[PDB]
Amino acid sequence: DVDLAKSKVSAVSKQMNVPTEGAFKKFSAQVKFDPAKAAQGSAQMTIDVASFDLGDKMYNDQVAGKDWFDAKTYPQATFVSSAIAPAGGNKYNVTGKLTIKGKAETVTVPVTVAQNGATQTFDGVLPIKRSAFNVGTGEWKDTSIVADEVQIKFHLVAT
Ligand SMILES: CC(C)=CCC/C(C)=C/CC/C(C)=C/CC/C(C)=C/CC/C(C)=C/CC/C(C)=C/CC/C(C)=C/CC/C(C)=C\COP(=O)(O)OP(=O)(O)O
């Protein structure tokens, strides 16, 4: 499987002179994938949500708090695949369970895969609604302040 230092998971939000992008500095992931048997593959990711870095300590503290991630109550977010559907041209629709702030949803993410030497790379973007996971509640429900749509971007490098 993977390499954190070589890999990146980020989230892009809007409001609306944006992107505002933050990156999770601590996560793990496991991938098992052979394009000759793609549907037999699997992947999981576990993110340490308190490691989310927007490049600003006050923003980082706010987003860790109860109305946002509530990182003390829910320290991790997870994705676990259940199916992989080839989409043609090194693209695969990867379906699985995304759990954020203790709320689970089935999601399908388009992933592009490349191999070069002993390295495999997995790139994709998953749009979600933060409200679906109750991320940014209370006064932060107002989507004229922070948009509901958040794009989760990942670049996973294995071996
Ligand atoms: C074929 C194969 C095997 C492929 C591999 C498959 C594979 C590994 C796929 C991976 C797919 C996925 C889903 C990967 C990600 C996995 C996980 C667990 C993702 C969860 C990440 C996560 C916690 C996402 C939630 C992100 C959210 C909703 C973040 C909130 C966004 C945020 C913090 C916005 C804050 C806005 C900011 C910084 C400031 C606002 O400032 P403000 O005060 O309002 O300014 P003003 O007042 O001026 O307006």
Residue numbers in the entry: 5 to 163
Give verbatim excerpts from the published study on this entry.
YceI proteins are a family of bacterial lipocalins (BCNs), which are small proteins widely conserved in Gram-negative and Gram-positive bacteria but whose physiological role is unclear. In this study, we discovered that secreted BCNs contribute to antibiotic resistance by capturing and neutralizing antibiotics in the bacterial milieu. Visual inspection and structural alignments by the DALI server confirmed a barrel-shaped lipocalin fold for both proteins. An octaprenyl pyrophosphate was bound within a long, hydrophobic tunnel extending from one end of the barrel in each structure.
BcnA is a secreted bacterial lipocalin required for full resistance of B. cenocepacia to different classes of antibiotics. To elucidate the mode of binding of antibiotics within BCNs, we first solved the X-ray crystal structures of BcnA and BcnB to 1.4- and 1.6-Å resolutions, respectively. Analysis with the PDBePISA server predicted that BcnA is a monomer, while BcnB is a dimer, by crystallographic symmetry (~2,840 Å2 of buried surface area including a portion of the tunnel opening). Superposition of BcnA chain A and BcnB chain C (148 Cα atoms, 22% sequence identity) resulted in a root mean square deviation (RMSD) of 1.66 Å. The largest structural differences observed were located in two of the loops that make up the tunnel opening. Using the established crystallographic structures, we applied molecular modeling and docking calculations to predict BCN binding modes of antibiotics. These studies suggested two distinct docked binding modes for BcnA. One binding mode involved residues in the rim of the lipocalin pocket. The second binding mode was predicted for more lipophilic molecules (e.g., Nile red), occurring deeper inside the lipophilic tunnel. Docking of α-tocopherol showed its alkyl chain buried in the BcnA tunnel and its cyclic head placed toward the entrance, similar to the Nile red binding pose.
